[PDB]
């Protein structure tokens, strides 16, 4: 804003204001798992 | 101005405002499970 008025005297005023703000967030959360189970043969047994 | 005098008045005012916000969403997920039974030891492959 600037206002200038002259009524037998010279007057001048100047005002400037600037504001800028930036905010950013990045996230990533991953959880993964794999369970396996085997059972061999070993043909022998205990029928004794 | 009229005899005799002089008056002058000037006023100026301007404003400007701008705002921008952007957000994006993307995620993927998938699960796969399996079971089996098979009746020499070479077949374990």
Curated annotation (Swiss-Prot), chain A:
It is found in: Secreted; Target cell membrane. Residues 3-24 are annotated as: Disordered. C-, N- and O-glycosylated. O-glycosylated with core 1 or possibly core 8 glycans. Coiled coil: none annotated. Residues 9-18 have a biased composition (Low complexity). Component of the membrane attack complex (MAC), a multiprotein complex activated by the complement cascade, which inserts into a target cell membrane and forms a pore, leading to target cell membrane rupture and cell lysis. The MAC is initiated by proteolytic cleavage of C5 into complement C5b in response to the classical, alternative, lectin and GZMK complement pathways. The complement pathways consist in a cascade of proteins that leads to phagocytosis and breakdown of pathogens and signaling that strengthens the adaptive immune system. C7 serves as a membrane anchor. Monomer or dimer; as a C5b-7 complex it can also form multimeric rosettes. Component of the membrane attack complex (MAC), composed of complement C5b, C6, C7, C8A, C8B, C8G and multiple copies of the pore-forming subunit C9. This is Complement component C7. The lineage of its organism: Eukaryota, Metazoa, Chordata, Craniata, Vertebrata.
Curated annotation (Swiss-Prot), chain B:
All cysteine residues are assumed to be cross-linked to one another. Individual modules containing an even number of conserved cysteine residues are supposed to have disulfide linkages only within the same module. It comes from the Eukaryota. The chain crosses the membrane at residues 1-9. It is found in: Secreted; Target cell membrane. Belongs to the complement C6/C7/C8/C9 family. Component of the membrane attack complex (MAC), a multiprotein complex activated by the complement cascade, which inserts into a target cell membrane and forms a pore, leading to target cell membrane rupture and cell lysis. The MAC is initiated by proteolytic cleavage of C5 into complement C5b in response to the classical, alternative, lectin and GZMK complement pathways. The complement pathways consist in a cascade of proteins that leads to phagocytosis and breakdown of pathogens and signaling that strengthens the adaptive immune system. Component of the membrane attack complex (MAC), composed of complement C5b, C6, C7, C8A, C8B, C8G and multiple copies of the pore-forming subunit C9. It is linked to Complement component 6 deficiency: A rare defect of the complement classical pathway associated with susceptibility to severe recurrent infections, predominantly by Neisseria gonorrhoeae or Neisseria meningitidis. This is Complement component C6. The chain holds residues 407 to 454 of 934 of the full protein.
